[PDB]
Design an enzyme around this catalytic site. Structure first.
Site, PDB file in Angstrom:
ATOM      1  N   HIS A  40      29.237 -19.312 -38.640  1.00 54.11           N
ATOM      2  CA  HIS A  40      30.138 -18.876 -39.701  1.00 54.11           C
ATOM      3  C   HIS A  40      30.424 -19.976 -40.715  1.00 54.11           C
ATOM      4  O   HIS A  40      31.057 -19.701 -41.744  1.00 54.11           O
ATOM      5  CB  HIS A  40      31.432 -18.289 -39.140  1.00 54.11           C
ATOM      6  CG  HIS A  40      32.375 -19.303 -38.581  1.00 54.11           C
ATOM      7  ND1 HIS A  40      32.481 -19.562 -37.231  1.00 54.11           N
ATOM      8  CD2 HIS A  40      33.273 -20.108 -39.191  1.00 54.11           C
ATOM      9  CE1 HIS A  40      33.402 -20.487 -37.036  1.00 54.11           C
ATOM     10  NE2 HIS A  40      33.903 -20.829 -38.207  1.00 54.11           N
ATOM     11  N   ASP A  84      27.550 -17.840 -32.266  1.00 52.70           N
ATOM     12  CA  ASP A  84      28.115 -18.568 -33.405  1.00 52.70           C
ATOM     13  C   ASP A  84      27.625 -20.016 -33.388  1.00 52.70           C
ATOM     14  O   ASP A  84      28.351 -20.965 -33.071  1.00 52.70           O
ATOM     15  CB  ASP A  84      29.634 -18.479 -33.386  1.00 52.70           C
ATOM     16  CG  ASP A  84      30.261 -18.936 -34.688  1.00 52.70           C
ATOM     17  OD1 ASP A  84      29.516 -19.123 -35.674  1.00 52.70           O
ATOM     18  OD2 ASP A  84      31.505 -19.084 -34.719  1.00 52.70           O
ATOM     19  N   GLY A 175      39.370 -25.625 -40.426  1.00 53.44           N
ATOM     20  CA  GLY A 175      38.769 -26.875 -40.834  1.00 53.44           C
ATOM     21  C   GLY A 175      38.049 -27.616 -39.728  1.00 53.44           C
ATOM     22  O   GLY A 175      37.296 -28.558 -40.019  1.00 53.44           O
ATOM     23  N   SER A 177      36.140 -25.860 -37.410  1.00 53.05           N
ATOM     24  CA  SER A 177      34.983 -25.055 -37.027  1.00 53.05           C
ATOM     25  C   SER A 177      33.692 -25.841 -37.142  1.00 53.05           C
ATOM     26  O   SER A 177      33.481 -26.575 -38.108  1.00 53.05           O
ATOM     27  CB  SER A 177      34.827 -23.845 -37.948  1.00 53.05           C
ATOM     28  OG  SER A 177      35.551 -22.751 -37.451  1.00 53.05           O
ATOM     29  N   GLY A 178      32.778 -25.590 -36.203  1.00 50.27           N
ATOM     30  CA  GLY A 178      31.478 -26.214 -36.204  1.00 50.27           C
ATOM     31  C   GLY A 178      31.434 -27.569 -35.552  1.00 50.27           C
ATOM     32  O   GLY A 178      30.342 -28.062 -35.245  1.00 50.27           O
TER      33      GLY A 178
END
Ligand SMILES: [Ca+2]
Lengths: 223, 32
Positions: A40, A84, A175, A177-178
């Site tokens: 995402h 994801d 902020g 995420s990932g």
């Protein structure tokens, strides 16, 4: 990161910032040319920023390398958030050193109860929005799938795990995420989603990297 | 994810068809 602490400059040398004019997601450097992040977090024109501590100040260790390819898992589902995971190939290879370094992929999945390090430049408030300048860190355990499914009925797939604290107060947030969840020196999770941040009985949900080791290897080879 | 917004329509790019809201200046549809 809510309820964490200042990591210290370049103490998480595999942590990257994804920037499309502003910081919007983290990622993890897995070799000189490739970064793992969340599906995402895909956008066109991602710039990967390595060697960062203060993301608002040039401190002298930064490498800014645009993504040449952003390979989202083909089966990513933006409604369920299953699969994801995304691989970003850098337009050119990063120079590895003490402050920019890769993180090992797992050879086996982690178990509930294992303590992990989660990091990022995301919001530090459970109510409201802050934007930290320097990288924040959080130690958090992997939670049982039973408690994870009780917290998120109908939403937890085999490619997700919960980590954090059911009592609240300590979590990843918008902020983050990932970014990495590193357990015993292995990248076991990717910051993915949750119901708010640091809320009671709503721990963070993370992509289960150990289910994608083969896909990661084949994607590197294909590109 | 961090995506700033004034209304939830500003979140369509990152939130796709997911339900959510624009709150405290940012997109809130569970993804971080
Ligand atoms: Ca900097």
């Amino acid at each position: 990161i809510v309820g964490g602490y200042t990591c210290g400059a370049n103490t998480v040398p595999y942590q990257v910032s994804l920037n499309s004019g502003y910081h919007f997601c983290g990622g993890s450097l897995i070799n000189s040319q490739w970064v793992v992040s969340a599906a995402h977090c895909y956008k066109s024109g991602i710039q990967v920023r390595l060697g960062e501590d203060n993301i608002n100040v040039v401190e002298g260790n930064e490498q800014f390398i645009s993504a040449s390819k952003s390979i989202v898992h083909p089966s990513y589902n933006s409604n369920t958030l299953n699969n994801d995971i995304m691989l970003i190939k850098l337009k050119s290879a990063a120079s590895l050193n003490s402050r920019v370094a890769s993180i090992s992929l797992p050879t086996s999945c982690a178990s509930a109860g294992t303590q992990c390090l989660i990091s990022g430049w995301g919001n530090t408030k459970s109510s409201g929005t802050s934007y930290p300048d320097v990288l924040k860190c959080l130690k958090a355990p992997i939670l049982s799938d039973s408690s994870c499914k009780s917290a998120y009925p109908g939403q937890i797939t085999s490619n997700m795990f919960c980590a954090g604290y059911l009592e609240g107060g300590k979590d990843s947030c918008q902020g983050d995420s990932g970014g990495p969840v590193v357990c015993s020196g292995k990248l076991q999770g990717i910051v993915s989603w949750g119901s708010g941040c640091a809320q009671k009985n709503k721990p963070g949900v993370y992509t289960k990297v150990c289910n994608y080791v083969s896909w990661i290897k084949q994607t590197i080879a294909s590109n | 994810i961090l995506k700033r917004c004034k209304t939830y329509d500003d979140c369509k790019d990152v939130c796709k068809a997911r339900k959510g809201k624009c709150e405290f200046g940012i997109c809130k549809c569970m993804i971080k």
